[PDB]
Design a protein around this ligand. Structure first.
Ligand SMILES: *[C@@H]1O[C@H](CO)[C@@H](O[C@@H]2O[C@H](CO)[C@@H](O)[C@H](O)[C@H]2NC(C)=O)[C@H](O)[C@H]1NC(C)=O
Lengths: 49, 49
């Protein structure tokens, strides 16, 4: 935010006044998420009689 | 009659959390008809899990 004002007057009346204001703001956000799960079950059976 | 059974149970758990937040704002104004004003802030926030 920025603002400037200037005024000058001198009688011989004459009066002059100038004001300037400029405001600018920017917001940026980002969100990333990842989830991975692996489940493996290996069962082997062998029987001889 | 022989019997031999072996069980090898293993469980591992690991969790890490880190968060960093930094915020800085600076504003300066000087007037001597002359008027000047400046205002600006900055904010930063980050978190990971
Ligand atoms: C954005 O940031 C927010 C900060 O509040 C996150 O919100 C929480 O984050 C914690 C971190 O582990 C989680 O346990 C909570 O479940 C979150 N809550 C909600 C309502 O989301 C958020 O995870 C971040 N990421 C996004 C929103 O995508």
């Amino acid at each position: 935010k920025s603002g400037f004002s200037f005024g000058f007057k001198i009688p011989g009346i004459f009066e002059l006044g100038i004001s300037s204001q400029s405001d600018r703001g920017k917001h940026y956000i980002r969100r990333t998420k990842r989830f991975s799960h692996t489940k493996s079950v290996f069962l082997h059976a062998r029987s001889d009689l | 009659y022989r019997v031999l059974f072996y069980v090898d149970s293993e469980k591992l758990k690991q969790n890490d959390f880190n968060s960093v937040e930094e915020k800085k704002c600076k504003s300066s104004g000087w007037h001597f008809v002359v008027k000047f004003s400046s205002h600006g802030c900055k904010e930063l926030e980050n978190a990971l899990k």
